[model samples]
Target: LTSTERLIQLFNSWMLNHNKFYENVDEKLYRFEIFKDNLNYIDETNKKNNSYWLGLNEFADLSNDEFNEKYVGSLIDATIEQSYDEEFINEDIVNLPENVDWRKKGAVTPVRHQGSCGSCWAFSAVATVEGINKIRTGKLVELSEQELVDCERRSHGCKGGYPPYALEYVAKNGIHLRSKYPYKAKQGTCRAKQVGGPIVKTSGVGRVQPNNEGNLLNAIAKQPVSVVVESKGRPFQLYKGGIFEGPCGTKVDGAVTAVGYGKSGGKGYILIKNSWGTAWGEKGYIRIKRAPGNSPGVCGLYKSSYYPTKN
Candidate 1:
C-alpha cells in the first residue's frame, strides 16, 4: 500500500496517466516492491547531492537489472564483427570549433523514444543519418527507424544491433522517411515496397580512431555521429541535467548521437542525444564531460564512434 501510494504520487508528478489496474494482483504487488527500490535508490543518490537528478520514470515499476537488460542491450552481438579499416582514420584531422550545437543550427531531428524495446542502436544511427542529411542537403527529414528495425536483417531487430551495421545497411539500401514507414517500436516484417522516398543516400560509413577526441570532434564537426557509451550506474539513470562527469567506464552497452561539443564553466563536454524520449535527461539529451586523452571518455563513447558520408 505504501509503495503503491508513493508510485501514484510519482505518476502524478511525472504526468503519467496510464491504467494501473492489473489482472494479476501478485504481479502488481511485485512491481510495487520494485518501485520502492527505485525510490530508495533515488533517495540515496539525492542524499549524496549528485550532479544530476533521478526520478520515477516509465520504467520505475521494473527493477534496475530488469530495466537495463530489456531496454539497454546495445552491446552488439559478437558474431556481427566490427570492420576496422585503416583508411577511415585521418591523422591530419583539424580541430573542431570551440563549440557547435547542431540542434540550434536546425540539423538535428526532434527527440525520439524507443519505448520498451532494446533498439536504441537503430534510433542513434537514424538520428545520425538525419542530421547529416540536413547538414548536407539544407533540409532536415525525419528518417524511419522502423525501416531499419525491420529491414536490416544483418543486425537484429529489437534484440540489439551495431551502428556501423545500421549505417552499412543504409549505405546499401537508402533510408526511408518516417512518414511512409513510421516508427512501430517493435519487430515487424520488412516492407521494402512500402519503403520508398529516399531523402538522402549514404556514400559510405566510417569510424573514428578509438580514444581520439580530436578525430571524434572532427567527425562531429562534419555531422552528428553515432557512438556507443557505457550507460551504467546512478549518474546515467537519474541524469537530469548539467555535464555528466562520472561513475562511467569502458563497457559499452548503449548507443546515442553525438550532435555537438562545448565547454561549461571551463569544463569541456560532448553533447549527446538519447532515444529515451524527451522526459529523460535534459529534454532527451546529455552533455558528457569531455576528457581528452581519456580513453572512452564518460562511457566508451569514443571507442565505437561512427558516421555516414553523403556525396
Candidate 2:
C-alpha cells in the first residue's frame, strides 16, 4: 500500500487524532517508515512470546530512543542518600494488607496527559501528593504538575528530576492546585503569586528501602508512592494490559506512581499509574510483575520510591 493509504489506516486503527501529523507529508512519511519497522518488531516479538504484545499506538512513529528522550522523564542525576524514616524501619511494624487498590479507594486522581514534555517527575510527584492528600482529607483534588515543572528550582523543569527534591519543595513551600496554577506542559517562569490554589502541605518524604518489596508494599499500603523505573524497552512503551513480565530491564529512566498491588491469574503485580493520557496503557496504568524479595523488582520499580506525608 502507498504511504498515504498506510497512514490513513494507521490513524484509524489507533483512533489517533492525526490532523497535525498530516501537516508535513515528508515528516509523516518518515514517521510512517519508522512505524512500519516498529510494527514488524512488535509482531515478531509477540509471535514468539505470550507474556506481552506490542501494537501500533500514538507513539508508533517515533523510535524507542526518541520516545524515551521525548516522553520518559526520571533523571538519575540526584542520589537517594537518605534512608526510610525511623518510624517505618521495622519489617514487623510495616505490615501491608494482602491487596490494596488506592484507585478503588478514591485516593488516586484521574489519569493525566503530560503531552510531549519530559515532566514525568512532576506528574509522578503530583500524583503521590494527590494520593496522600486524598487519603488524609477524603477529597480527591487535582494538583498542579505545572507548579512543580516551573517552581521546583532544585530539579530541572522539563529536562528531568528526582522525586525526593520535588517532595522536598512540597515540604518547604506547599504546592498549588490544577485549577489555580494549571499545567502548561512546558518550562516557564514560576508564578508564585498567581498560585491561588489550595496549598498542599507536606511534612517530609518517606523513602522505601531500596530493592525491598516489603518496604515498597508497606509504603503503598499507606498511600500511593512515587516510583522510578526503566521504561526504555518496547514491552514498556506498547504495554496493553495484563501483569507485565519481562523483556524489561533495570535501567531506571521514567518516574510513575505505584497506587496499589494485587494478583491476576495467580501472578502478583504492582498497579502503576503512568503520566501519559488515558489513551495509553490500560487506561493510563500498567501492572508490573510483582517480584517479591527481588530488589529493583522488574524495571527497578522497587529501586527508588517515596511518599509525602501531609502536614
Candidate 3:
C-alpha cells in the first residue's frame, strides 16, 4: 500500500478504535512531498502567490547551510511569542465557530486569511494582540488589521512582510479597535511610511506557536492564541468525501486562523476559522491534516505567536 493508503488505513483504524467522529469531507489523499513542494513555493518564491504571503523573504536569509550552522535546530523551532489568555473574546471570532463543542475558544473573531494580500506578518502580529487584549481586559477588543497594514510600511502588505517587523511595530504603537476601521483581504497603497491608527506597536507580550492543534488546545484553554497556517489555497473551497493521505500539493493562496482541533479517523484535524464571512468550510472553518508536518499539513500555524508574561 502507498503511504497515503497506509495513513488512511491507520487513520481509519485509529478513528474506529477510538470512536472518534468526523464528517467525511473528501477523498483527496496527500503525501508529504506534495505539500513539501508547496512549502518550497513559500520558501523560495516571494511573488508566487499574489493572494497571500509566503515565508520566502530574505529576512536575514540564512541559507539552509548558514541557518543550520548558526541556530542549528532553533531556526526550525523558533516562532513569534505572546502573552497570557483572557476571558473576553473577539466577536468576529466567536460568531464564526463551525460547531458548538468544536469551538475551543470562548468568543473571539475568526482568523482572517489575507488572500494574495501578503499580510501574514500583520495578521500574525495582530492575532497575538487581539487575543492578549481580550484576556487582559476581560472584554472583546476588536484589534484593527488595517492599522497594522497601513502602519507597518517596513513590512509588505499584499506582497509580503516579516513577523519581527510586525512585532516591533505593535510594541511601538499598540493595536487599536477594528471598530475604528476594518479589514480588506486586498492590498492597498502605502502612503510613504504613513502609520496612522489608535494602536501602539507592542513588543514583549509573550511567545507564539504554529497552528498545531495540540498547542492550540493547551494555549486557548488558558488564553486566545495567534496562529498563521498555510491556507490550502482556497477559502470557500469545498470537499465532499474521501480518505486523505499522501502528498497533495496545491497552490497555497491564502493565510487563515486556526481555533481548535479534534480527532477524526484517528488523525488530528485543526478546526480553522476563516474570515470569508460564515459560508466556507464547515461554516467559515476547514479541517486540515495536523500531523507529519511539511505535507498536506496547514503551514499557517507554523509561525504562530502568543503574549508571554515578562518576569
Candidate 4:
C-alpha cells in the first residue's frame, strides 16, 4: 500500500492516455505485467544514456510477440541484388547538400495512421508518389492507399506488400484520389474507377543497391526513399525521441518513407515518415540512426531501398 500505489497510478494514467481497454481483472493484470516490464526496460535503457531513450507509447502494454505478429510480415526480402537501375545511375549525385528535408520543400504530405493493418508498404509507396508528384508539378495531392490495397494484384494488400512492387503497380494503374477511394486499413474490394483531376502517376520503380549509403543519400535528396526498418525490443517499439541508436540484426518489421537525412549531435540520422499515425515517433516520424561506416547501415536501412521517378 506504500510505493506500489504510485506505479498503479502511472499504469492507470497510461491506460487512459492510450485509450486502452481490458475486459476484466485477469486480462488487465496480464497487461499490467507486460506494461511494467516494458516500463522497467525503458527506465533501464534511458539510464544508459546512449543516443536514444525508450518511453511508454501505445505499444507499451502489448507484448513484443503480439506486436510483431500484428504489425510485421515476411513478404519483403532484405537480401536485394546489387544493381544500378536506370534512374539511379542517371542522377548526378555529386555536390550534394549537407542536409535535406523534403517536407519543408512542400513535397511531403501529413503523417497518417496504418492502424492494426499490415499496410506499411502501401503507405510508404503512396507517400513517395505524393512527394514526387508534388516536386514534379507543384500538385501535392493525397493519393488513395486503398487503390493499391484493393487493385494491386501483385502482392497482398493489407496482409503485406513490398513497397517497390507497390510502386510498380502505381506506375501501371495510377492511384486515385484519397477522398475518392479512402483508406479502410483492411483488404476491401477493388474500386478501380480512375476518374479524377490528378490521378497521380510515377515513371517507374528505381532501386538502390544493398550496402550503398551515398547513393541512398542522393536518391532521397531527389525523392523520398522507401526503406524497411527492423524494430527491436522496447527501444524501437517504445521510442519517443532523440537519435535512434538501434539494436539491429533483427527481421524488418515494417516499411517507411525516408524523407531526408541530417547530422544531429555529430551523429547521422535518416528522417523517416512512418504510418503508425502522428501519435508515435516524432509525430509519425523517426530519425533512424545512420551508421555510414557499416555496410547495411543501422536497421538495414541500406539493405532494401527504392524510389519512383518523375517524367
Please write out the lDDT profile of model 3 over residues 112-137, one tens digit for every residue: 54443556556655655565555565
Tens digit of lDDT per residue, candidate 1, span 79-132? 434664333556434454789889888998889888878888999999898888
What is the TM-score ranking, best to worst? 4, 2, 1, 3
Superposed by TM-score, candidate 4 places the C-alpha of residue 266 at a distance from the truth, in angstroms, of 1.2
C-alpha lDDT values of all predictions: 0.77, 0.78, 0.44, 0.78
Model 1 CA lDDT for position 139:
89
Clashes of each: 0, 0, 69, 0
Clashing pairs in 2: none
Error of 2 at 289 (Å): 0.5
Best by TM-score: 4
Worst 10 residues of 3 by lDDT: 68-77
Q: For model 2, where is the 10-residue window of minimal lDDT?
A: 85-94
- Model 1 misplaced stretches (Cα beyond 4 Å): 1-32, 77-95
Instruction: Show model 3 residue runs off by greater than 4 Å.
Output: 1-105, 110-116, 184-217, 232-254, 292-311
* Pairs in clash, predicted candidate 1: none
TM-scores, all models, native as reference: 0.86, 0.90, 0.51, 0.91
